[PDB]
Each structure stands twice: as C-alpha cells, then as structure tokens.
Symmetry: C3
Subunit: 289 residues, 3 copies
Amino acid sequence: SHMFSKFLMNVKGVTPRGSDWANRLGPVALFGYGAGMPRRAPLLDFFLQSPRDCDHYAELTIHDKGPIECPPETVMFMPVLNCGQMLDEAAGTETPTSDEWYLGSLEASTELLEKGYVPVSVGGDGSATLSMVEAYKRLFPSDDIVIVHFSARPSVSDPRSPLRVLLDKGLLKGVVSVGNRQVSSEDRKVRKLHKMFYMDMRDIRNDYPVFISIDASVLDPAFAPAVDSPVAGGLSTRDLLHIMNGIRGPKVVGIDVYGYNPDLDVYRKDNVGLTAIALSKIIKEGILK
Amino acid sequence: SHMFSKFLMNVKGVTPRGSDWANRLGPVALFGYGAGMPRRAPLLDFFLQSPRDCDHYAELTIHDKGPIECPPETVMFMPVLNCGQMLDEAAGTETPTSDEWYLGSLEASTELLEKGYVPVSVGGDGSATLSMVEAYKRLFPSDDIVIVHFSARPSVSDPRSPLRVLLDKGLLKGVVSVGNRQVSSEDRKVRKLHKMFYMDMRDIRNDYPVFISIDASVLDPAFAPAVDSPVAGGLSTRDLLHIMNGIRGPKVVGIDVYGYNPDLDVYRKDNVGLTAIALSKIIKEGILK
Amino acid sequence: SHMFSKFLMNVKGVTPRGSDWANRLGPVALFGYGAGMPRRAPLLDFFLQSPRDCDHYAELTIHDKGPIECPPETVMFMPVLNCGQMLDEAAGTETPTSDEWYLGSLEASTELLEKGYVPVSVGGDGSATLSMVEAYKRLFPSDDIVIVHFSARPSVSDPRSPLRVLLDKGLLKGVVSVGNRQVSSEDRKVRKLHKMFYMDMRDIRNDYPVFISIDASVLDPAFAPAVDSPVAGGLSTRDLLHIMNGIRGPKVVGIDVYGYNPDLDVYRKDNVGLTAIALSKIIKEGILK
C-alpha cells in the first residue's frame, strides 16, 4: 500500500542495535497496527501519553531516533523505539487489504527483528500475530517458536485465523491458550489433534522463545468492553497482569496486542475509553522484560 | 391479561417431552418475563442472539417447535425451547397487574412443568420466583423445594417479597442466600427465625430439588449496573459463575433471572448494555445442567 | 473564605459529645470537602441518600443537630453528624484558595476533634489529609499518628503532596501505603529513606491511632473511573472493603475519602456515576468502627 510508504521508509533506516547490547534483552520497537479495526487508531498514541511508571520497578523510556543507549546493571530503564502507525493519516483514504496489511506487517517485523529489536504490534484484529512470527521463522528457521495466546476464544476453528495458520505450517512447536471461555467442538477437536495446552477460566519454565499474543477479549467486558462479541466471566486487568508476569522464556519473539475498537468502548464523561485505559497498561507491562 | 393470550395459546400446545427422555435431566423451556420492569424487554432476545458456546464443554441448542430430540451419552447438547415473551408487543398497551403477571407466570410455569421441561423465566423483578415454585408444589406437593437465592439483599423483610411469601407458606424446606451485602435488622431477625443459611460477601451436597433465583443485583455494579439501587462490593461475573457451578441437587425446579432494567444500564458506544452482556452469560450457564 | 462562613458558623456550635460516651468509640462527624475538584460536589449528598444498611451487621444513623445519644452494648447503631458541605452553594462564586481550603479544613477538623467526634472529610483531592491530621497533633502532640494510605501512587515525590508534608514534619510515626501501582524512582527513594511500609498490587495489630486516607484511584478504573489519570490493574470495591476491614488500631484519628470528580465518571443511562456508587459504599464501611 502507498499508505505504509512513509512507515516503510522509516522502519528501514533505524540505526541498528549496537554492541552496547551484548547478551542483552531488547531493545523494543513499537508500531501501530490497524487491520480489521476502524481507520482511526488512537491507543498507540494513547499509550504514548500514558504514565511511564510501570507496575514493577522498571521505567519505560521512549525514543523516536537511533541509536539508543543501554542501561547499566541494577538500575532499570526500558528504552522503546516508536515506529508510529502503519497507516499514514495524510496520504490517502485507500485503506489496505489483508494481503497489504500482512506484507507490510511482515516487512516491518522482519526489519525490526533483523536489527535486534523485539517487535510489539499494537492494535488491529490479531492478524499481526501471523506476520510477526513468520518474519521470525524466516530469519530464524532453527529457533522453536511457541505462543502464549490470551483470548475469550481459541481462535483456531477458522483456517484464516492467525494461530490456526501457524500450527498447520508447523512453525509452532506449541500453543498455550489462556483465558478461553467460548469453546466450540471445532476448537476442542483441533485442540487434542495439535496437542496444545490450555487453561479456560506456577512457572511456564521453558527455554523456548515466546511470542505473546493478547486479545483484549480475554479480559472481562467490565474492564475491556471494546471488543466485537464481548464475553463475560473474564479476567480483571490485574488477573492478566499476574498471569502475564509468570510467562517464562529465553526471549520474547514479539507481542501483538489487538481486539480493541474505539467504537465499541464504554467512555467516561470526558471521552476516555475504559479499554484504552486497560490496554495501555497491558502494553507497558508487556514491554517490561 | 389479553396481552399473554398469544403467549398463553402457545405454551399450552407444545408437544410434550417424550420417551427419548427416560431418567433424563431436562429439557429446558424458556420465556421472557417483564414484571416490574419497563415495557420493552430485550435481554431474552439478546440471549437468543448471543453465542451458544458455553463456559463448560456443552452447547445450547434453541428450538421453537416440538417435539425435540434427546442427545446421546457423552456428546453434549442442551436443547432449549423458546416460548418467547409473556407480553405480546402488538396486541395493546394494557400492561398487566401484579395478579395478572402472577396468574400467567403461574399458568406458564405449571404448563411447562406438567410437560417435563425445566422452566427458566428471564427478566422482571423477581416475582417470577413465587409463581414458578408454586406451580411446582401444586404439581408436586410431596417434593421438598429449596431455593438458592443470589442478591445484594435478602429480599425478605417485605411480606410481599417472593421468598418471604414462600417461607411463610411452608413451601420452602430451606433457603440458601448468597452474596447478601445490604442486611437490615429486619432481614436478620427473619433469618434466625426461619433457620435459613446465608453467605454474605464446598459442595451443596443435597438431594433436595433446587429452584435457582438470581438477582442481577448480586453482581458488582461494575459488571451489572442495571439494577434499582445498585450495591457496590459485589460479585464479578466469574464469581457468580463459580458459585453457580457448585450448586448441587437431584434436579432444578426452575430458574428466574431478574433485576435488569435497560434504562439503568451502562452502555458501550454502540448501545450494548454491560448488564445484558453479563446476564446473557448467566442464563446460558444456568441452563447447562 | 466567605464561602465557609455558614459552614464555619455551624461547626462551632454543635453540642459536644457527652458522658453517654465513656471509654467509647465515636461519634462520627461528617462534612463535604471540595478542594481540587469542580465546584459541584454531590457525593456527600449522594452518600446521604444511599442505603444505611452496612456490609457488616451495624447500621448508620444520620443526625443534623446535637446532642446525639449513644447505643447500648450488643445492639449496634452508628450515629453520624452531618456538618454538610464546606462550600456554601448560595453565598458567592469566590471559590477558595489552597490556603483557604486548608485553614478551614484545619479549623473544622480541630473543632470536630475538640468535641470528641471522629472527623470524616469526603471529596476533594486529598489535601484534607494534611489539615485533619495536623488538627489532631495540635490537640494531641503526644499521640503518635500513623496513616494507612490507599492510592495508585505513593503521592510523596511532590513536596506539596499531603503525606510528604506530614512525614517531613515528623508528625507521622509511620506510613502504610496500600495498592500502589505507579511508582517512580522518586517514590522509591523517599520510601526507604523514611522507612515506611508498602504493599503494591494478617492483622495490622498496632496500638497507634489510625488516620485513614483513601484515594479512589486505588480501586480499578472499572469500579472507580472518576479519577485524574486512572490506573488500571486495581482493586475491586470488595478488595478495598476487605483490606479496609483488617485495619487495626486504638482509634481512628480521621478519614479522608478523595479523588472523585463527577466530570470523569462513567454514567449509567439514568446519570448515576459508577464512582459515586463505589465510593458511597467506601465511606459507609469507613464509618463502621
């Protein structure tokens, strides 16, 4: 798409992660992804205006240009690179197709992963799980990639769905699905047939690189109302942050936080979305690692 | 009332539960009850448009005509009969009185119970607890009926209130009141005087037929804002679903889910009520048995 | 301020607590405090229209004139004196300054504490923590005052902030900060330097007089959306009520419930604020002691 051109022109030329990072986790690179959601994507911009003070005793630090410097030892920063929104809000109305959102997301993730940033794609419908993990396996076909998937639904009955696509491509050496509460016979047959683990409503303890995929639908509609067909009986924001805290790994391959649609949110009297508040926290503590 | 005529004409002629059910639980028969709430009652209709996929590994199946067939053994369906709304939305504006809502609810429940459907009355103010359990004791005066009551208040200080009426009629061999957090000296005197059990904010393990009465007021106002004088410090939707899961019995005599008023709800930006979402789940997993 | 004149004229002449109270806890004296929030302060008035039935088996009793009588032994009442709003809604538009809000709050608290009422200041931004505990130490400089502080932030990095001011004045023999989830390096340095205890997201067991300071920001934005920069991952209303229940002491020096701003709230379809509902409960069970 001509829409991503300016995003694309930007992702390429970011000064690579240097030798300041030796056997070091990070850095993180952030962008806004808008597939399957309305044309206006705040949330990213809402996350950038949010407190930098984390739940745990580390602090986010946001940079637009490179190179960026590594913190030392015991004093914790968390330097995050803002690549901004995929969609240029000033270069047309020609909104991309699923192939265009994908090819770009694949190209961004690839160009973020090449440089040693941990990619984090925020917004959209969850399609940016497929592309980002596929950029990783392209780069590192030797690395075993697993996925920790948080949603109200397994999101696997449909062959188009991004986890179903990965499983069948044998890119996934395993799927951990957490929070599921809308399970059909389609989801349960595909479950024991691809031997994945699940926890419907301690330590993960693995040496396998973790992709983290977070559907806002996993929370309760009370905390995250801004989803398609919201599913009650869900997680509190704190419930997710707890379980998220306990994810183990040698490294995170990437993070896709999706499912949020401004039009479906419950709003304060000053026009702030409950789901924006909730998810803005979720992204923060997803970066903290 | 002339309003129920079409509902009444309909409840009578439903093809009875057959020999497909031998020593079998169910089937379920659904209707919408509107006493003490505005004339428009969605929720029923909102429940019918909701996902059929339960929290637990069974699936609801909704039929308008009879007879319906019984599932086999290990593969779980949950066939539910839609009797629709009491109030015909096209036969007048003459909204019934408390005697009319009662006489009908009594007549529906009686005509649902005669045929071996487990009645489930959705909407209203909780008056459809009194009528439905009284249709049961009319049919089965030998059967001991207990009630598991979920509300923010005991709803017993007032002699008009539907549990207070049953207790004094000695139809109730016991009351389990769960979730209470607005208790007056009126409620507490009537408590130790009618020796009922309560749990204000494991297994029930009884052989006594269970009526299940669910006031949306039992949840938190965060999850179920759509109630008269909402009471904070309440249940999450998941909290109720847990405690509900643990109800024991030889059979359920019926289920009344009430307390919901569209006018009092908090709404998403697309006009969906938080309480509708919450309660639509509650009814589902109330049928699952 | 000329605004408080009518409030001031009123606080002075309240008939003192008599000999009906001998080695007795209470009574309580209530007023509405509006510092740092819009000119309209409902909440107080919303609390007065709320159910008197507590979570625990005691009942609030609200009196406007004095003297009031003490309950006997095992039968529990909780007689609370309504001093109304600081700001007279009919004597000008000249809204006070931070010195005026303070001098008055200091004068009210002093004139409430002199007479043996436990002061409870409802509304505002939390400034009514500083004044009320300083009226206490003026009266009783011998008494060791500690504070149990509930907020999303430690509220101590800023030298203007009311707990930071007390600590440095050595009025505080200790600070218990509960619920914190936005902690900067400013908050953490000031923490181990003033040796206070904290619990970010059994019995307190102390003989030290307790001030209770409650920022609505401590709850989750799902339960209490009506705060400045709301912080997700918070307490449920029930979570706070539990932890609040477990506060120990020889006496409470006072209670400031703040952080609520009508303009920032999520509202039902009938214009009731979720935060009003939540906080109206919080004040109730804060008085119960």
